[PDB]
mmCIF file of C-alpha atoms in Angstrom:
data_model
loop_
_atom_site.group_PDB
_atom_site.id
_atom_site.type_symbol
_atom_site.label_atom_id
_atom_site.label_comp_id
_atom_site.label_asym_id
_atom_site.label_seq_id
_atom_site.Cartn_x
_atom_site.Cartn_y
_atom_site.Cartn_z
ATOM 1 C CA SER A 1 11.231 16.181 12.497
ATOM 2 C CA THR A 2 11.174 12.516 11.550
ATOM 3 C CA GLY A 3 9.179 9.397 12.294
ATOM 4 C CA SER A 4 9.920 5.689 12.052
ATOM 5 C CA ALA A 5 7.418 2.865 12.534
ATOM 6 C CA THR A 6 7.579 -0.873 12.030
ATOM 7 C CA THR A 7 5.070 -2.406 9.615
ATOM 8 C CA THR A 8 4.043 -6.045 10.087
ATOM 9 C CA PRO A 9 2.371 -8.535 7.702
ATOM 10 C CA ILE A 10 -1.171 -9.369 8.751
ATOM 11 C CA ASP A 11 -0.821 -13.058 7.846
ATOM 12 C CA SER A 12 1.610 -15.667 6.551
ATOM 13 C CA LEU A 13 1.068 -14.585 2.916
ATOM 14 C CA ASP A 14 1.865 -10.875 3.345
ATOM 15 C CA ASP A 15 -1.668 -10.065 2.188
ATOM 16 C CA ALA A 16 -1.259 -6.606 3.726
ATOM 17 C CA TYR A 17 0.831 -4.799 6.328
ATOM 18 C CA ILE A 18 -0.279 -2.992 9.484
ATOM 19 C CA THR A 19 1.489 -0.118 11.212
ATOM 20 C CA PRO A 20 0.565 1.184 14.691
ATOM 21 C CA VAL A 21 -0.775 4.751 14.737
ATOM 22 C CA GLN A 22 -1.547 6.876 17.804
ATOM 23 C CA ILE A 23 -4.779 8.890 17.555
ATOM 24 C CA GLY A 24 -6.126 11.329 20.121
ATOM 25 C CA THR A 25 -5.368 12.319 23.700
ATOM 26 C CA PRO A 26 -4.735 10.091 25.586
ATOM 27 C CA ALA A 27 -3.424 8.072 22.672
ATOM 28 C CA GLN A 28 -5.616 5.395 21.126
ATOM 29 C CA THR A 29 -3.387 3.036 19.145
ATOM 30 C CA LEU A 30 -4.927 1.527 16.004
ATOM 31 C CA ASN A 31 -3.196 -0.715 13.467
ATOM 32 C CA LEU A 32 -3.640 0.910 10.064
ATOM 33 C CA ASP A 33 -2.937 -0.223 6.499
ATOM 34 C CA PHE A 34 -0.630 2.422 5.005
ATOM 35 C CA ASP A 35 -1.859 2.812 1.430
ATOM 36 C CA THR A 36 0.123 4.793 -1.160
ATOM 37 C CA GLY A 37 -2.783 4.177 -3.559
ATOM 38 C CA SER A 38 -5.396 6.222 -1.662
ATOM 39 C CA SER A 39 -5.630 9.441 0.297
ATOM 40 C CA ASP A 40 -8.068 8.972 3.214
ATOM 41 C CA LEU A 41 -7.125 8.219 6.815
ATOM 42 C CA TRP A 42 -10.186 6.324 8.045
ATOM 43 C CA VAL A 43 -10.771 4.174 11.110
ATOM 44 C CA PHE A 44 -13.176 1.754 12.672
ATOM 45 C CA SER A 45 -14.820 3.746 15.419
ATOM 46 C CA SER A 46 -17.450 3.952 18.126
ATOM 47 C CA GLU A 47 -19.722 5.172 15.291
ATOM 48 C CA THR A 48 -19.293 2.061 13.121
ATOM 49 C CA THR A 49 -22.463 -0.029 12.754
ATOM 50 C CA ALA A 50 -22.030 -2.620 15.487
ATOM 51 C CA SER A 51 -22.796 -5.618 13.248
ATOM 52 C CA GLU A 52 -19.933 -4.510 10.960
ATOM 53 C CA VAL A 53 -17.279 -4.594 13.712
ATOM 54 C CA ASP A 54 -15.658 -8.015 14.349
ATOM 55 C CA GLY A 55 -12.497 -7.803 16.432
ATOM 56 C CA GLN A 56 -11.047 -4.499 15.216
ATOM 57 C CA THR A 57 -9.800 -1.870 17.625
ATOM 58 C CA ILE A 58 -12.002 1.226 17.435
ATOM 59 C CA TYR A 59 -11.329 4.941 17.756
ATOM 60 C CA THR A 60 -13.690 6.621 20.222
ATOM 61 C CA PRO A 61 -13.559 10.382 19.596
ATOM 62 C CA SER A 62 -15.601 11.177 22.719
ATOM 63 C CA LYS A 63 -12.679 9.839 24.801
ATOM 64 C CA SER A 64 -10.128 12.138 23.119
ATOM 65 C CA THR A 65 -9.732 15.615 24.595
ATOM 66 C CA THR A 66 -8.217 16.840 21.306
ATOM 67 C CA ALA A 67 -10.912 15.468 18.971
ATOM 68 C CA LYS A 68 -13.202 17.960 17.247
ATOM 69 C CA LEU A 69 -16.060 17.183 14.886
ATOM 70 C CA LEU A 70 -15.358 18.610 11.440
ATOM 71 C CA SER A 71 -18.863 19.955 11.111
ATOM 72 C CA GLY A 72 -20.755 18.890 7.999
ATOM 73 C CA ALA A 73 -17.923 16.797 6.584
ATOM 74 C CA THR A 74 -18.591 13.314 5.227
ATOM 75 C CA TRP A 75 -16.545 10.797 3.294
ATOM 76 C CA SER A 76 -17.203 7.763 1.141
ATOM 77 C CA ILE A 77 -14.626 5.640 -0.645
ATOM 78 C CA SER A 78 -14.634 2.619 -2.944
ATOM 79 C CA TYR A 79 -11.443 0.685 -3.590
ATOM 80 C CA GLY A 80 -10.292 -1.229 -6.648
ATOM 81 C CA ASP A 81 -11.129 -4.543 -4.963
ATOM 82 C CA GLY A 82 -14.799 -3.597 -4.612
ATOM 83 C CA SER A 83 -14.622 -2.811 -0.884
ATOM 84 C CA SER A 84 -15.898 0.457 0.552
ATOM 85 C CA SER A 85 -16.493 2.514 3.676
ATOM 86 C CA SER A 86 -18.051 5.848 4.624
ATOM 87 C CA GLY A 87 -18.790 8.110 7.561
ATOM 88 C CA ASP A 88 -18.106 11.489 9.168
ATOM 89 C CA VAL A 89 -14.920 13.321 10.130
ATOM 90 C CA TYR A 90 -13.060 14.513 13.208
ATOM 91 C CA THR A 91 -9.801 16.365 13.484
ATOM 92 C CA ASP A 92 -7.386 15.034 16.090
ATOM 93 C CA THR A 93 -3.720 14.552 16.899
ATOM 94 C CA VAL A 94 -2.145 11.674 14.981
ATOM 95 C CA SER A 95 1.353 10.297 15.563
ATOM 96 C CA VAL A 96 3.286 7.725 13.545
ATOM 97 C CA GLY A 97 6.563 6.428 14.899
ATOM 98 C CA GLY A 98 7.197 9.585 16.924
ATOM 99 C CA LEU A 99 6.095 12.077 14.234
ATOM 100 C CA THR A 100 3.047 14.091 15.313
ATOM 101 C CA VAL A 101 0.480 15.995 13.239
ATOM 102 C CA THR A 102 -2.117 18.124 14.993
ATOM 103 C CA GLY A 103 -5.425 18.785 13.290
ATOM 104 C CA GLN A 104 -5.285 15.680 11.096
ATOM 105 C CA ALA A 105 -8.574 14.661 9.502
ATOM 106 C CA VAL A 106 -9.537 11.302 11.008
ATOM 107 C CA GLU A 107 -12.401 9.838 9.011
ATOM 108 C CA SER A 108 -14.675 7.859 11.324
ATOM 109 C CA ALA A 109 -16.456 4.943 9.668
ATOM 110 C CA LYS A 110 -20.185 4.644 10.099
ATOM 111 C CA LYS A 111 -20.315 1.830 7.523
ATOM 112 C CA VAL A 112 -17.723 -0.598 6.165
ATOM 113 C CA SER A 113 -18.117 -3.344 3.578
ATOM 114 C CA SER A 114 -17.873 -7.023 4.384
ATOM 115 C CA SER A 115 -14.206 -7.466 3.489
ATOM 116 C CA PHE A 116 -13.234 -4.890 6.122
ATOM 117 C CA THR A 117 -15.439 -6.468 8.804
ATOM 118 C CA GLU A 118 -13.995 -9.884 7.969
ATOM 119 C CA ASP A 119 -10.391 -8.723 8.473
ATOM 120 C CA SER A 120 -9.983 -8.329 12.221
ATOM 121 C CA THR A 121 -6.324 -7.263 11.894
ATOM 122 C CA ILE A 122 -6.877 -3.976 10.012
ATOM 123 C CA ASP A 123 -8.359 -1.103 12.054
ATOM 124 C CA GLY A 124 -8.447 1.320 9.109
ATOM 125 C CA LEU A 125 -6.351 2.841 6.344
ATOM 126 C CA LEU A 126 -3.806 5.655 6.269
ATOM 127 C CA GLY A 127 -3.675 7.061 2.748
ATOM 128 C CA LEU A 128 -0.362 8.240 1.312
ATOM 129 C CA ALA A 129 -1.285 9.083 -2.298
ATOM 130 C CA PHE A 130 -1.823 12.718 -3.282
ATOM 131 C CA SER A 131 -4.397 14.736 -1.368
ATOM 132 C CA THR A 132 -6.314 15.454 -4.593
ATOM 133 C CA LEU A 133 -7.823 11.949 -4.183
ATOM 134 C CA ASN A 134 -9.139 12.577 -0.658
ATOM 135 C CA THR A 135 -12.886 11.945 -0.558
ATOM 136 C CA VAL A 136 -13.966 14.303 2.248
ATOM 137 C CA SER A 137 -16.821 16.584 1.204
ATOM 138 C CA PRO A 138 -17.485 19.487 1.014
ATOM 139 C CA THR A 139 -13.934 20.432 2.085
ATOM 140 C CA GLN A 140 -11.255 18.045 0.840
ATOM 141 C CA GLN A 141 -8.686 17.113 3.483
ATOM 142 C CA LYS A 142 -4.921 16.562 3.427
ATOM 143 C CA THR A 143 -3.097 13.293 4.008
ATOM 144 C CA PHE A 144 -0.923 12.718 7.059
ATOM 145 C CA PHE A 145 2.180 13.091 4.875
ATOM 146 C CA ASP A 146 0.935 16.327 3.299
ATOM 147 C CA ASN A 147 0.244 17.780 6.759
ATOM 148 C CA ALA A 148 3.626 16.644 8.125
ATOM 149 C CA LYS A 149 5.694 17.569 5.071
ATOM 150 C CA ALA A 150 6.737 21.103 5.982
ATOM 151 C CA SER A 151 7.991 19.970 9.405
ATOM 152 C CA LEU A 152 9.988 17.010 8.122
ATOM 153 C CA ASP A 153 13.762 17.184 7.810
ATOM 154 C CA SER A 154 13.297 16.176 4.159
ATOM 155 C CA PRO A 155 9.912 15.981 2.351
ATOM 156 C CA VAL A 156 9.979 12.221 1.870
ATOM 157 C CA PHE A 157 8.728 8.959 3.229
ATOM 158 C CA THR A 158 10.116 5.491 2.560
ATOM 159 C CA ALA A 159 8.550 2.044 2.372
ATOM 160 C CA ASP A 160 10.715 -0.958 3.282
ATOM 161 C CA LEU A 161 8.282 -3.875 3.296
ATOM 162 C CA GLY A 162 9.454 -7.296 4.447
ATOM 163 C CA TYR A 163 8.989 -10.668 2.811
ATOM 164 C CA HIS A 164 7.263 -12.796 5.445
ATOM 165 C CA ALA A 165 8.797 -10.423 8.004
ATOM 166 C CA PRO A 166 8.314 -6.941 9.473
ATOM 167 C CA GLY A 167 9.622 -3.844 7.736
ATOM 168 C CA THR A 168 9.651 -0.076 8.191
ATOM 169 C CA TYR A 169 7.939 3.148 7.157
ATOM 170 C CA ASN A 170 10.159 6.183 7.722
ATOM 171 C CA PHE A 171 9.107 9.828 7.417
ATOM 172 C CA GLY A 172 11.482 12.698 6.801
ATOM 173 C CA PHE A 173 14.754 10.846 6.207
ATOM 174 C CA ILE A 174 16.379 8.158 4.082
ATOM 175 C CA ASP A 175 18.047 5.392 6.135
ATOM 176 C CA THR A 176 21.201 4.763 4.117
ATOM 177 C CA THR A 177 21.780 1.492 6.022
ATOM 178 C CA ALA A 178 18.487 0.029 4.765
ATOM 179 C CA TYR A 179 19.457 -0.648 1.142
ATOM 180 C CA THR A 180 22.356 -1.816 -1.000
ATOM 181 C CA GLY A 181 23.922 0.052 -3.879
ATOM 182 C CA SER A 182 22.360 3.342 -4.939
ATOM 183 C CA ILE A 183 18.789 4.631 -5.178
ATOM 184 C CA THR A 184 17.562 5.182 -8.754
ATOM 185 C CA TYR A 185 15.021 7.975 -9.028
ATOM 186 C CA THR A 186 12.353 8.110 -11.710
ATOM 187 C CA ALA A 187 9.727 10.655 -12.749
ATOM 188 C CA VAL A 188 6.215 10.714 -11.296
ATOM 189 C CA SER A 189 2.961 11.928 -12.806
ATOM 190 C CA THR A 190 0.464 13.200 -10.244
ATOM 191 C CA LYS A 191 -2.273 13.703 -12.859
ATOM 192 C CA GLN A 192 -4.370 10.783 -11.554
ATOM 193 C CA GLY A 193 -3.465 11.429 -7.907
ATOM 194 C CA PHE A 194 -1.167 8.384 -7.654
ATOM 195 C CA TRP A 195 2.563 7.762 -7.385
ATOM 196 C CA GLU A 196 2.493 6.965 -11.101
ATOM 197 C CA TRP A 197 5.734 6.169 -12.914
ATOM 198 C CA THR A 198 7.046 4.299 -15.971
ATOM 199 C CA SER A 199 9.087 1.137 -15.608
ATOM 200 C CA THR A 200 11.637 0.575 -18.365
ATOM 201 C CA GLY A 201 10.950 -3.137 -18.888
ATOM 202 C CA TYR A 202 11.128 -6.605 -17.437
ATOM 203 C CA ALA A 203 12.791 -10.003 -17.441
ATOM 204 C CA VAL A 204 11.507 -13.449 -16.480
ATOM 205 C CA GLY A 205 13.956 -15.573 -14.498
ATOM 206 C CA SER A 206 17.374 -15.651 -16.127
ATOM 207 C CA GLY A 207 15.921 -14.478 -19.442
ATOM 208 C CA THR A 208 16.932 -11.430 -21.403
ATOM 209 C CA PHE A 209 15.573 -8.047 -20.402
ATOM 210 C CA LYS A 210 12.768 -6.671 -22.576
ATOM 211 C CA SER A 211 12.936 -2.890 -22.896
ATOM 212 C CA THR A 212 9.362 -1.605 -22.894
ATOM 213 C CA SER A 213 7.610 1.238 -21.093
ATOM 214 C CA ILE A 214 5.143 0.107 -18.424
ATOM 215 C CA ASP A 215 3.177 2.930 -16.803
ATOM 216 C CA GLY A 216 1.899 2.008 -13.356
ATOM 217 C CA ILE A 217 1.439 3.057 -9.742
ATOM 218 C CA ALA A 218 3.477 2.315 -6.619
ATOM 219 C CA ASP A 219 0.691 1.040 -4.341
ATOM 220 C CA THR A 220 1.492 -0.338 -0.885
ATOM 221 C CA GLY A 221 -2.222 -1.020 -0.364
ATOM 222 C CA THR A 222 -2.432 -3.574 -3.194
ATOM 223 C CA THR A 223 -1.102 -7.052 -2.429
ATOM 224 C CA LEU A 224 -0.083 -8.256 -5.898
ATOM 225 C CA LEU A 225 1.742 -7.076 -9.030
ATOM 226 C CA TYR A 226 -0.704 -6.283 -11.849
ATOM 227 C CA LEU A 227 0.867 -5.901 -15.299
ATOM 228 C CA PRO A 228 -0.192 -6.033 -18.956
ATOM 229 C CA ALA A 229 -1.494 -9.368 -20.180
ATOM 230 C CA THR A 230 1.453 -9.824 -22.568
ATOM 231 C CA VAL A 231 3.970 -9.511 -19.713
ATOM 232 C CA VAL A 232 1.983 -11.753 -17.373
ATOM 233 C CA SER A 233 1.571 -14.453 -20.042
ATOM 234 C CA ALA A 234 5.325 -14.405 -20.686
ATOM 235 C CA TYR A 235 5.982 -14.939 -16.967
ATOM 236 C CA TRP A 236 3.532 -17.794 -16.388
ATOM 237 C CA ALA A 237 4.547 -19.562 -19.608
ATOM 238 C CA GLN A 238 7.788 -20.387 -17.744
ATOM 239 C CA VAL A 239 5.906 -22.322 -15.031
ATOM 240 C CA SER A 240 4.826 -25.850 -15.982
ATOM 241 C CA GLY A 241 1.093 -26.275 -15.510
ATOM 242 C CA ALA A 242 0.330 -22.604 -14.859
ATOM 243 C CA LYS A 243 -2.892 -21.326 -16.389
ATOM 244 C CA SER A 244 -5.348 -18.480 -16.143
ATOM 245 C CA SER A 245 -8.501 -19.656 -14.371
ATOM 246 C CA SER A 246 -11.664 -17.633 -14.921
ATOM 247 C CA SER A 247 -13.340 -19.473 -12.038
ATOM 248 C CA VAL A 248 -10.566 -18.651 -9.565
ATOM 249 C CA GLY A 249 -10.000 -15.149 -10.947
ATOM 250 C CA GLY A 250 -6.441 -15.205 -12.240
ATOM 251 C CA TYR A 251 -3.347 -17.233 -12.878
ATOM 252 C CA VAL A 252 -2.880 -20.339 -10.770
ATOM 253 C CA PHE A 253 0.014 -22.762 -10.755
ATOM 254 C CA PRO A 254 0.900 -26.135 -9.227
ATOM 255 C CA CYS A 255 1.899 -25.705 -5.593
ATOM 256 C CA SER A 256 4.753 -28.143 -6.344
ATOM 257 C CA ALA A 257 6.399 -25.608 -8.694
ATOM 258 C CA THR A 258 9.517 -23.567 -8.055
ATOM 259 C CA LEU A 259 8.743 -20.112 -9.467
ATOM 260 C CA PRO A 260 11.180 -18.026 -11.514
ATOM 261 C CA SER A 261 12.112 -14.542 -10.430
ATOM 262 C CA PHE A 262 10.701 -11.443 -12.123
ATOM 263 C CA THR A 263 12.820 -8.351 -12.790
ATOM 264 C CA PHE A 264 11.454 -4.858 -13.433
ATOM 265 C CA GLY A 265 13.377 -1.848 -14.702
ATOM 266 C CA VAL A 266 13.761 1.493 -12.949
ATOM 267 C CA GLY A 267 15.649 3.626 -15.423
ATOM 268 C CA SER A 268 18.822 1.700 -16.166
ATOM 269 C CA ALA A 269 18.557 -0.129 -12.816
ATOM 270 C CA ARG A 270 16.872 -3.454 -12.116
ATOM 271 C CA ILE A 271 14.817 -4.737 -9.180
ATOM 272 C CA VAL A 272 14.630 -8.526 -8.855
ATOM 273 C CA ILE A 273 11.546 -10.098 -7.266
ATOM 274 C CA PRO A 274 12.523 -13.615 -6.086
ATOM 275 C CA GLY A 275 10.251 -16.399 -7.264
ATOM 276 C CA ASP A 276 9.110 -17.214 -3.732
ATOM 277 C CA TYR A 277 7.597 -13.723 -3.425
ATOM 278 C CA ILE A 278 5.174 -14.653 -6.246
ATOM 279 C CA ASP A 279 3.661 -17.630 -4.367
ATOM 280 C CA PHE A 280 0.354 -16.792 -2.655
ATOM 281 C CA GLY A 281 -0.408 -20.319 -1.579
ATOM 282 C CA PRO A 282 -3.330 -22.669 -2.056
ATOM 283 C CA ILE A 283 -6.424 -21.185 -3.670
ATOM 284 C CA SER A 284 -8.457 -22.844 -0.900
ATOM 285 C CA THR A 285 -7.311 -24.681 2.180
ATOM 286 C CA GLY A 286 -5.608 -27.939 1.234
ATOM 287 C CA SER A 287 -5.650 -27.361 -2.531
ATOM 288 C CA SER A 288 -2.605 -28.159 -4.640
ATOM 289 C CA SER A 289 -3.437 -25.231 -6.936
ATOM 290 C CA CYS A 290 -1.643 -22.094 -5.815
ATOM 291 C CA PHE A 291 -2.494 -18.472 -6.565
ATOM 292 C CA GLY A 292 0.003 -16.382 -8.491
ATOM 293 C CA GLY A 293 1.411 -13.086 -7.280
ATOM 294 C CA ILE A 294 1.700 -11.596 -10.778
ATOM 295 C CA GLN A 295 -1.687 -11.048 -12.421
ATOM 296 C CA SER A 296 -3.073 -9.233 -15.438
ATOM 297 C CA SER A 297 -4.108 -5.595 -15.136
ATOM 298 C CA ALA A 298 -6.252 -5.877 -18.277
ATOM 299 C CA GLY A 299 -9.519 -5.496 -16.342
ATOM 300 C CA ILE A 300 -8.273 -2.671 -14.086
ATOM 301 C CA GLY A 301 -7.273 0.169 -16.406
ATOM 302 C CA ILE A 302 -3.892 0.742 -14.739
ATOM 303 C CA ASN A 303 -0.823 -1.317 -13.913
ATOM 304 C CA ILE A 304 -0.157 -1.692 -10.192
ATOM 305 C CA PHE A 305 3.248 -2.212 -8.565
ATOM 306 C CA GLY A 306 1.781 -3.621 -5.368
ATOM 307 C CA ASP A 307 3.445 -5.246 -2.375
ATOM 308 C CA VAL A 308 4.885 -8.165 -4.405
ATOM 309 C CA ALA A 309 7.046 -5.673 -6.295
ATOM 310 C CA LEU A 310 7.597 -3.050 -3.610
ATOM 311 C CA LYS A 311 8.772 -5.532 -0.955
ATOM 312 C CA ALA A 312 11.729 -6.437 -3.205
ATOM 313 C CA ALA A 313 12.976 -2.827 -2.927
ATOM 314 C CA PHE A 314 13.656 0.098 -0.651
ATOM 315 C CA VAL A 315 11.229 2.681 -2.044
ATOM 316 C CA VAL A 316 11.483 6.459 -1.634
ATOM 317 C CA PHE A 317 8.313 8.501 -2.046
ATOM 318 C CA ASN A 318 9.827 11.931 -2.666
ATOM 319 C CA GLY A 319 7.286 14.684 -2.036
ATOM 320 C CA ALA A 320 9.483 17.570 -3.133
ATOM 321 C CA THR A 321 7.870 20.289 -5.252
ATOM 322 C CA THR A 322 8.296 17.976 -8.232
ATOM 323 C CA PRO A 323 7.639 14.514 -6.750
ATOM 324 C CA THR A 324 9.712 11.516 -7.794
ATOM 325 C CA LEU A 325 10.060 7.851 -6.811
ATOM 326 C CA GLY A 326 13.304 6.132 -5.842
ATOM 327 C CA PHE A 327 14.049 2.400 -5.862
ATOM 328 C CA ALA A 328 17.041 0.563 -4.427
ATOM 329 C CA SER A 329 17.806 -3.108 -4.012
ATOM 330 C CA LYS A 330 18.149 -4.326 -0.428
#
């Protein structure tokens, strides 16, 4: 089997991407944030505290003839941005782009933190990291990809995120029309539960490539590119007036600037992030200070190849017995 679904930016900055997902019988379609940095499929629901729901579409398990309470199971997750959610668990039929999994754990939110309530466009998350990170207790549950894997034509999914435009998540096949050149594959460590890999270096604009190992994660659920402070300083030093602002929470730059590109290495290959992809717009409405799309990971503990980086590539998440990542230009 295969599946193919379009993923759409939630706003004009590409702060996140939503993909329609069918849950239950008859189908209830929710727009979920596909997140290769986590491993829970959770949804706003008829169980979510009413004051914490503000415009999201909810899953109502009592209206699904295929929903079954997973008795005794609870979940609770905290994300790197400080947001969180928790609740109980149903199993139900879940379909993405024509690919169907029966018996998928659908984690129903009883509580969500303010950032989720405040984002009316995201109805929940669909985790695509390794199932070892799934938070369901006392019986850990498998991701949608893990459950689908054996049925897929090939044990892969691909992320093709658009810049200020829709893109595609495919399951079970590699669309050879969706990229240019060849796909360069690179080793993955699953030891922390992430799609963790080592970039071979970077360049700023037209500058020379610096060969240096940068361990990080391919994370579709993180907006920006978080890299070591040395790398990030070298990038922003090429932008007149750019500075790190403790009050804003990162590097800012004059909105009048034209940003240089940023290149990262994948083996001997190179992925070029155009400068425009690094512009996240005014820090507050009407400001002439703009927020940078490359930020320091120093306070995180891990480097994160988020959407800023991934959207410059066609990315293969290869879930073969030994997982690997592939990157192609597009």
